[PDB]
PDB file of C-alpha atoms and ligand atoms in Angstrom:
ATOM      1  CA  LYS A  20     -45.545  -5.755  48.757  1.00 58.74           C
ATOM      2  CA  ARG A  21     -48.973  -4.431  49.740  1.00 60.52           C
ATOM      3  CA  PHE A  22     -50.331  -3.450  46.295  1.00 59.89           C
ATOM      4  CA  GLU A  23     -49.342  -5.199  43.058  1.00 57.65           C
ATOM      5  CA  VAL A  24     -50.529  -4.530  39.508  1.00 54.05           C
ATOM      6  CA  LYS A  25     -51.843  -7.559  37.607  1.00 53.92           C
ATOM      7  CA  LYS A  26     -53.621  -6.155  34.531  1.00 50.36           C
ATOM      8  CA  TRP A  27     -53.004  -3.063  32.425  1.00 45.96           C
ATOM      9  CA  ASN A  28     -55.196  -1.510  29.734  1.00 46.07           C
ATOM     10  CA  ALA A  29     -52.930   1.162  28.280  1.00 43.75           C
ATOM     11  CA  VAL A  30     -53.862   2.719  24.936  1.00 45.01           C
ATOM     12  CA  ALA A  31     -50.990   3.407  22.532  1.00 45.33           C
ATOM     13  CA  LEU A  32     -51.235   6.222  19.998  1.00 42.37           C
ATOM     14  CA  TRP A  33     -49.062   6.118  16.883  1.00 44.52           C
ATOM     15  CA  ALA A  34     -47.981   8.650  14.275  1.00 43.65           C
ATOM     16  CA  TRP A  35     -46.108   8.100  11.020  1.00 47.81           C
ATOM     17  CA  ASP A  36     -42.835   9.773  10.013  1.00 50.34           C
ATOM     18  CA  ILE A  37     -44.389  13.202   9.504  1.00 48.72           C
ATOM     19  CA  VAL A  38     -40.999  14.853  10.223  1.00 47.09           C
ATOM     20  CA  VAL A  39     -42.143  17.470  12.752  1.00 48.54           C
ATOM     21  CA  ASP A  40     -38.990  19.468  11.979  1.00 46.02           C
ATOM     22  CA  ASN A  41     -39.430  19.515   8.162  1.00 44.09           C
ATOM     23  CA  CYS A  42     -42.820  19.688   6.447  1.00 44.07           C
ATOM     24  CA  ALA A  43     -42.885  16.960   3.802  1.00 45.24           C
ATOM     25  CA  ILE A  44     -44.334  19.466   1.291  1.00 46.41           C
ATOM     26  CA  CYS A  45     -42.761  22.852   2.118  1.00 44.57           C
ATOM     27  CA  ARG A  46     -39.819  21.918   4.409  1.00 47.31           C
ATOM     28  CA  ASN A  47     -40.228  24.500   7.146  1.00 48.66           C
ATOM     29  CA  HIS A  48     -41.653  22.665  10.206  1.00 47.49           C
ATOM     30  CA  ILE A  49     -44.833  21.023  11.479  1.00 46.19           C
ATOM     31  CA  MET A  50     -45.744  24.515  12.738  1.00 42.75           C
ATOM     32  CA  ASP A  51     -44.506  28.121  12.400  1.00 41.32           C
ATOM     33  CA  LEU A  52     -46.229  29.042   9.125  1.00 39.49           C
ATOM     34  CA  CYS A  53     -45.290  27.790   5.650  1.00 36.02           C
ATOM     35  CA  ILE A  54     -43.417  28.829   2.494  1.00 36.90           C
ATOM     36  CA  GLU A  55     -46.295  30.920   1.082  1.00 34.54           C
ATOM     37  CA  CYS A  56     -47.043  32.570   4.440  1.00 35.79           C
ATOM     38  CA  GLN A  57     -43.529  33.037   5.853  1.00 33.96           C
ATOM     39  CA  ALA A  58     -43.947  35.962   8.263  1.00 31.71           C
ATOM     40  CA  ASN A  59     -46.303  35.411  11.187  1.00 31.92           C
ATOM     41  CA  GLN A  60     -48.683  38.258  10.329  1.00 31.31           C
ATOM     42  CA  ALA A  61     -48.135  38.589   6.554  1.00 27.70           C
ATOM     43  CA  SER A  62     -51.580  40.221   6.367  1.00 30.81           C
ATOM     44  CA  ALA A  63     -53.269  37.237   7.988  1.00 29.19           C
ATOM     45  CA  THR A  64     -56.839  38.586   7.639  1.00 31.27           C
ATOM     46  CA  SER A  65     -58.374  35.765   9.707  1.00 27.58           C
ATOM     47  CA  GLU A  66     -58.416  32.520   7.655  1.00 24.12           C
ATOM     48  CA  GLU A  67     -55.963  29.957   9.142  1.00 22.76           C
ATOM     49  CA  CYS A  68     -52.510  28.405   8.715  1.00 21.49           C
ATOM     50  CA  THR A  69     -52.775  25.452  11.102  1.00 19.27           C
ATOM     51  CA  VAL A  70     -51.813  21.779  10.693  1.00 19.97           C
ATOM     52  CA  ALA A  71     -53.909  19.300   8.705  1.00 19.00           C
ATOM     53  CA  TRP A  72     -54.148  15.651   9.772  1.00 18.52           C
ATOM     54  CA  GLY A  73     -55.190  12.922   7.350  1.00 16.53           C
ATOM     55  CA  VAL A  74     -56.685   9.470   7.731  1.00 17.21           C
ATOM     56  CA  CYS A  75     -53.154   8.076   7.272  1.00 11.94           C
ATOM     57  CA  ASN A  76     -51.793   9.848  10.394  1.00 12.02           C
ATOM     58  CA  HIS A  77     -49.763  12.232   8.221  1.00 14.65           C
ATOM     59  CA  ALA A  78     -49.457  15.899   9.151  1.00 13.88           C
ATOM     60  CA  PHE A  79     -48.676  18.906   6.973  1.00 12.99           C
ATOM     61  CA  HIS A  80     -49.636  22.560   6.919  1.00 14.27           C
ATOM     62  CA  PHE A  81     -53.210  23.047   5.738  1.00 11.85           C
ATOM     63  CA  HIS A  82     -52.009  25.508   3.094  1.00 12.07           C
ATOM     64  CA  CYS A  83     -49.327  23.134   1.786  1.00 12.70           C
ATOM     65  CA  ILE A  84     -51.553  20.134   1.102  1.00 13.58           C
ATOM     66  CA  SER A  85     -54.515  22.339   0.145  1.00 15.75           C
ATOM     67  CA  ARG A  86     -52.336  23.602  -2.700  1.00 18.03           C
ATOM     68  CA  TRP A  87     -50.878  20.111  -3.249  1.00 18.20           C
ATOM     69  CA  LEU A  88     -54.372  18.722  -3.928  1.00 17.24           C
ATOM     70  CA  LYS A  89     -54.183  20.471  -7.321  1.00 17.70           C
ATOM     71  CA  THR A  90     -50.882  18.789  -8.238  1.00 14.70           C
ATOM     72  CA  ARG A  91     -51.754  15.231  -7.170  1.00 16.61           C
ATOM     73  CA  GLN A  92     -54.362  13.475  -5.024  1.00 17.19           C
ATOM     74  CA  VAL A  93     -52.430  10.741  -3.160  1.00 19.66           C
ATOM     75  CA  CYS A  94     -50.393  11.637  -0.036  1.00 17.59           C
ATOM     76  CA  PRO A  95     -46.780  11.903  -1.246  1.00 12.41           C
ATOM     77  CA  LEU A  96     -45.259   9.718   1.476  1.00 15.15           C
ATOM     78  CA  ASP A  97     -47.639   6.864   0.559  1.00 16.68           C
ATOM     79  CA  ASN A  98     -50.284   5.898  -1.994  1.00 15.66           C
ATOM     80  CA  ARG A  99     -53.420   6.535   0.112  1.00 16.54           C
ATOM     81  CA  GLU A 100     -56.350   8.838  -0.604  1.00 20.03           C
ATOM     82  CA  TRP A 101     -55.812  11.871   1.612  1.00 21.56           C
ATOM     83  CA  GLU A 102     -58.575  12.752   4.084  1.00 18.52           C
ATOM     84  CA  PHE A 103     -58.993  15.720   6.432  1.00 19.27           C
ATOM     85  CA  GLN A 104     -59.721  13.887   9.699  1.00 16.96           C
ATOM     86  CA  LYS A 105     -58.338  16.710  11.875  1.00 20.19           C
ATOM     87  CA  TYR A 106     -57.391  20.391  11.778  1.00 21.01           C
ATOM     88  CA  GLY A 107     -54.640  21.766  13.994  1.00 19.38           C
ATOM     89  CA  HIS A 108     -52.032  20.129  16.184  1.00 22.41           C
TER      90      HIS A 108
ATOM     91  CA  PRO B 385     -20.553   2.417 -15.100  1.00 22.56           C
ATOM     92  CA  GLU B 386     -19.548   1.480 -11.552  1.00 22.94           C
ATOM     93  CA  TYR B 387     -19.546   5.142 -10.533  1.00 24.79           C
ATOM     94  CA  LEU B 388     -22.925   5.617 -12.223  1.00 26.80           C
ATOM     95  CA  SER B 389     -24.265   2.658 -10.238  1.00 25.87           C
ATOM     96  CA  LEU B 390     -22.896   4.149  -7.014  1.00 24.23           C
ATOM     97  CA  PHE B 391     -24.532   7.488  -7.836  1.00 24.00           C
ATOM     98  CA  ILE B 392     -27.898   5.870  -8.541  1.00 28.79           C
ATOM     99  CA  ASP B 393     -27.603   3.866  -5.307  1.00 26.29           C
ATOM    100  CA  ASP B 394     -26.891   7.071  -3.377  1.00 25.32           C
ATOM    101  CA  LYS B 395     -29.898   8.754  -4.998  1.00 24.55           C
ATOM    102  CA  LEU B 396     -32.159   5.740  -4.367  1.00 25.99           C
ATOM    103  CA  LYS B 397     -31.219   4.894  -0.766  1.00 28.45           C
ATOM    104  CA  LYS B 398     -32.923   8.019   0.612  1.00 27.10           C
ATOM    105  CA  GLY B 399     -34.508  11.075  -0.973  1.00 26.44           C
ATOM    106  CA  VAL B 400     -33.298  13.509   1.677  1.00 24.90           C
ATOM    107  CA  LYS B 401     -32.384  15.874  -1.166  1.00 24.23           C
ATOM    108  CA  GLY B 402     -35.485  16.752  -3.151  1.00 24.02           C
ATOM    109  CA  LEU B 403     -38.216  15.406  -0.882  1.00 24.39           C
ATOM    110  CA  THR B 404     -40.899  15.960  -3.523  1.00 24.87           C
ATOM    111  CA  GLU B 405     -41.253  13.843  -6.649  1.00 23.88           C
ATOM    112  CA  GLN B 406     -40.752  16.323  -9.511  1.00 18.85           C
ATOM    113  CA  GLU B 407     -37.023  16.889  -9.001  1.00 13.15           C
ATOM    114  CA  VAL B 408     -36.512  13.171  -8.322  1.00 14.50           C
ATOM    115  CA  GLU B 409     -38.180  12.377 -11.648  1.00 11.57           C
ATOM    116  CA  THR B 410     -36.082  14.985 -13.460  1.00 11.66           C
ATOM    117  CA  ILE B 411     -32.800  13.753 -11.961  1.00 11.60           C
ATOM    118  CA  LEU B 412     -33.678  10.122 -12.750  1.00 13.92           C
ATOM    119  CA  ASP B 413     -34.486  11.103 -16.342  1.00 18.12           C
ATOM    120  CA  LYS B 414     -31.159  12.927 -16.603  1.00 18.88           C
ATOM    121  CA  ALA B 415     -29.341   9.910 -15.141  1.00 16.78           C
ATOM    122  CA  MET B 416     -30.910   7.493 -17.620  1.00 17.06           C
ATOM    123  CA  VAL B 417     -30.198   9.913 -20.479  1.00 16.57           C
ATOM    124  CA  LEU B 418     -26.547   9.970 -19.400  1.00 19.24           C
ATOM    125  CA  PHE B 419     -26.572   6.167 -19.212  1.00 20.26           C
ATOM    126  CA  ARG B 420     -27.976   6.062 -22.756  1.00 18.49           C
ATOM    127  CA  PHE B 421     -24.673   7.332 -24.192  1.00 15.86           C
ATOM    128  CA  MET B 422     -22.682   4.665 -22.344  1.00 11.29           C
ATOM    129  CA  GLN B 423     -21.163   1.326 -23.309  1.00 10.35           C
ATOM    130  CA  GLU B 424     -20.207  -1.750 -21.258  1.00  6.77           C
ATOM    131  CA  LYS B 425     -23.702  -2.395 -19.931  1.00  2.00           C
ATOM    132  CA  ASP B 426     -22.735  -5.762 -18.411  1.00  2.00           C
ATOM    133  CA  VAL B 427     -20.687  -4.236 -15.591  1.00  2.00           C
ATOM    134  CA  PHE B 428     -23.433  -1.649 -15.076  1.00  2.00           C
ATOM    135  CA  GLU B 429     -26.041  -4.380 -14.632  1.00  2.00           C
ATOM    136  CA  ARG B 430     -23.754  -6.402 -12.351  1.00  2.44           C
ATOM    137  CA  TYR B 431     -23.079  -3.430 -10.077  1.00  2.00           C
ATOM    138  CA  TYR B 432     -26.750  -2.427 -10.114  1.00  2.00           C
ATOM    139  CA  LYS B 433     -27.658  -5.944  -8.961  1.00  2.00           C
ATOM    140  CA  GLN B 434     -24.992  -5.746  -6.248  1.00  2.00           C
ATOM    141  CA  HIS B 435     -26.432  -2.416  -5.085  1.00  2.00           C
ATOM    142  CA  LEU B 436     -29.913  -3.962  -5.090  1.00  2.00           C
ATOM    143  CA  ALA B 437     -28.609  -6.776  -2.890  1.00  2.01           C
ATOM    144  CA  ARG B 438     -26.942  -4.275  -0.551  1.00  2.00           C
ATOM    145  CA  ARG B 439     -30.060  -2.095  -0.251  1.00  3.09           C
ATOM    146  CA  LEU B 440     -32.564  -4.955   0.102  1.00  2.00           C
ATOM    147  CA  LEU B 441     -30.575  -7.058   2.596  1.00  2.00           C
ATOM    148  CA  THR B 442     -30.199  -4.027   4.905  1.00  2.00           C
ATOM    149  CA  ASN B 443     -32.684  -1.814   6.759  1.00  2.00           C
ATOM    150  CA  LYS B 444     -35.874  -1.729   4.705  1.00  2.00           C
ATOM    151  CA  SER B 445     -38.291   1.142   3.968  1.00  2.00           C
ATOM    152  CA  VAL B 446     -35.821   3.112   1.853  1.00  3.75           C
ATOM    153  CA  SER B 447     -38.347   4.380  -0.701  1.00  2.42           C
ATOM    154  CA  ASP B 448     -40.966   1.575  -1.041  1.00  2.00           C
ATOM    155  CA  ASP B 449     -42.333   3.220  -4.215  1.00  2.00           C
ATOM    156  CA  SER B 450     -39.322   4.163  -6.344  1.00  3.96           C
ATOM    157  CA  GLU B 451     -38.555   0.508  -7.138  1.00  3.29           C
ATOM    158  CA  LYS B 452     -41.424   0.440  -9.645  1.00  2.00           C
ATOM    159  CA  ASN B 453     -40.116   3.614 -11.288  1.00  2.00           C
ATOM    160  CA  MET B 454     -36.610   2.134 -11.456  1.00  2.00           C
ATOM    161  CA  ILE B 455     -37.805  -1.106 -13.046  1.00  2.24           C
ATOM    162  CA  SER B 456     -40.001   0.803 -15.514  1.00  2.71           C
ATOM    163  CA  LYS B 457     -37.077   3.007 -16.559  1.00  2.51           C
ATOM    164  CA  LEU B 458     -34.841  -0.054 -16.923  1.00  2.84           C
ATOM    165  CA  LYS B 459     -37.525  -1.699 -19.074  1.00  5.33           C
ATOM    166  CA  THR B 460     -37.835   1.393 -21.273  1.00  2.71           C
ATOM    167  CA  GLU B 461     -34.045   1.850 -21.581  1.00  2.09           C
TER     168      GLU B 461
HETATM  169 ZN1   ZN C 501     -45.455  22.987   4.951  1.00  2.43          ZN
HETATM  170 ZN1   ZN C 502     -49.643  29.269   5.256  1.00  2.00          ZN
HETATM  171 ZN1   ZN C 503     -50.303   9.929   3.972  1.00  2.49          ZN
END
């Protein structure tokens, strides 16, 4: 051949079993609102109902784990202190 | 006792029903309460050990946290 690849420097991103189809706290989805918001509008009045990403690569609705912080303080699928490293998908 | 062991194995292999911890704790408490009014504990322990062997010598990462709860409940019961 005329051109051949010798080295590769790909970067691999990983995500845990967040179950994009069932929120691990509310069991609706990784998007499309939550149990306490339901309808899309539901008198939104600004604020937000996006996805929250932790330091453990877990994803839930911001509302779900914001409320869950009052019940416990360690991400339910593990035993790690939950951070708020990202907001939204 | 064998059927109780099978039920606890089915509940422990995967928490697809009751993803959160509160209902899991309640159902485990109910199961151990039911086991309290039971005799012939030797066969129960034998079948529980067999289920442990089946669930540990197969695909891992079943619960990874509920084992401590199970051993604590067995200690207390
Ligand atoms: Zn949710
Ligand atoms: Zn919401
Ligand atoms: Zn986590």
